[PDB]
Amino acid sequence: MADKEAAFDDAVEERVINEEYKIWKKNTPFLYDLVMTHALEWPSLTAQWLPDVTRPEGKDFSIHRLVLGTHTSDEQNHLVIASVQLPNDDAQFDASHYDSEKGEFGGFGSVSGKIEIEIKINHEGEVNRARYMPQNPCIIATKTPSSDVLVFDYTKHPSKPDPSGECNPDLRLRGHQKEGYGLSWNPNLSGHLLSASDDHTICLWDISAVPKEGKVVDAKTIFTGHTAVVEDVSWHLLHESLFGSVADDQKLMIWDTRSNNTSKPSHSVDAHTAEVNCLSFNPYSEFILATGSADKTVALWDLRNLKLKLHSFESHKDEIFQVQWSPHNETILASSGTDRRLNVWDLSKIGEEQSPEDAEDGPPELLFIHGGHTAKISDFSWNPNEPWVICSVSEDNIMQVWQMAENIYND
């Protein structure tokens, strides 16, 4: 009865998905400068580009790397480092993009970039979120279905995993009681890691002095200001004491580590009209952050006056789970979620006068809609070394490395 109408709603929407994908596949030469669709072995709940890029001399490509996880209900889940062949910006545009190999004069053109798996490390349950520490990018922290946050060093592990299945983390970080998804490393303090969880708490560890030899580290500070499930937490990128957290009590809370009150934050906004799932600070604007939520909106915030919302970005059709600023342009925001769309926003076009044809397509700050995933996008990541290149993963084992066309943004 309850699963009868749920399977009725999933079967009507699957024909809407299959009709939307083939229209998107026809529109792919006019929308993108790169499409790399790779079917993964297992679905990934996390995606983040490693910041190192190796560029071989004489070749038109470079090797970029990704931090991936697996989302299996069987007991062989893996922390996965993959490697992507991305073309350089001094390389010639041809038919090597769009996963194509048909030449433009009746034959073969060029090959596309390939995605292989380098390192697999055994993991206690599925990887909810995996993030590298920026001061040492060999250190990757993960989130488990249990209460433990695990810290991995992939140079101290073999590339092929054990068939025994024993997960051996380099550190075991405890302090939570339930699972969670939020994770943030401090870029101005080494080893300061934040984590959000379902036990209404934010934990903070300092692992900068303990050796990475399998010991158990307890939490330095536990922040108990939220009253519901804490979805995401993020450090500020310039000031080392400030961090932000969003939760299921519709609240954005800005904290300070110099405060002694660990149950009351520095500021607190009634941020949305539903559960707030993600936040991201601007890397170029020190007062600006963005929060995304289950009321199909992205909210723009100013830290100097948090009681007034700056802007509401409205084009999504379902619950928004990840928001990320672009690390090359300060006005470029991206967001994804349950509506199988990754929207790219441009806040410099806020307030521009449109035609009524263009008003039906959306607001003028909406720049691009990625319509390539056929399931719910769990996580995405901007490439920090190649501009406008986004990896994005979804629940149907689909990872898409893509870049939009140049005349959309450059005018």
Binding site: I23, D358, D361, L367, I369, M404, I408
Partner: peptide
């Protein structure tokens, strides 16, 4: 054409 297609990726225009 390219900027209007960016905001309507499910438009078939055919």
């Amino acid at each position: 054409c390219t900027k209007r297609c960016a905001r309507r990726p499910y438009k078939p225009c055919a």
